[PDB]
Amino acid sequence: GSSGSSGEYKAGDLVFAKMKGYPHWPARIDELPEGAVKPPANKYPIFFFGTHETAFLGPKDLFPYKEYKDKFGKSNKRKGFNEGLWEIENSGPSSG
To answer: Which of 24, 31, 55, 66 has CB atoms 3.0–4.6 Å from 72's, for a disulfide?
Structure first.
């Protein structure tokens, strides 16, 4: 139990990622390997589930999964999207 809003996302959290004209895509906060691209400060390695794509977004383009899980986490059927909506549910702490 740890006071602080701490609205700045961390690896292993889950989010919705909105690209320009795509849905609120199911995505995860990942971490960075010991040798890949350096993003700009504030941004995160967002991994887009069901398409497995990688882009850099900052927190304003992004939404906390548990706040939008039922709002945005719904069957948008874009191809990949039903996979990623399964992948994200089954990625996160569930049943425990």
So the answer is: 24
Domains of the chain, each with CATH number or no CATH: 1-96 (2.30.30.140)
For this PDB entry, the determination method is: NMR
The residues, ordered by sequence, that sit 6+ positions from 40 with a Cβ below 8 Å of its Cβ are 56, 58
Query: Residue 55: exposed, middle, or buried by beta-carbon count in 10 A (0-12, 13-18, 19+)?
Result: middle
Phi and psi for 65 in degrees, rounded to 5? -50, -60
What six digits make up the tokens of 35?
A: 């040798």
DSSP 30-94: ----TTS--PPTT-EEEEETTTTEEEEE-GGGEEEHHHHTTTT-S---SSSHHHHHHHHHTTS--
- Residue 22 is given by DSSP the state B
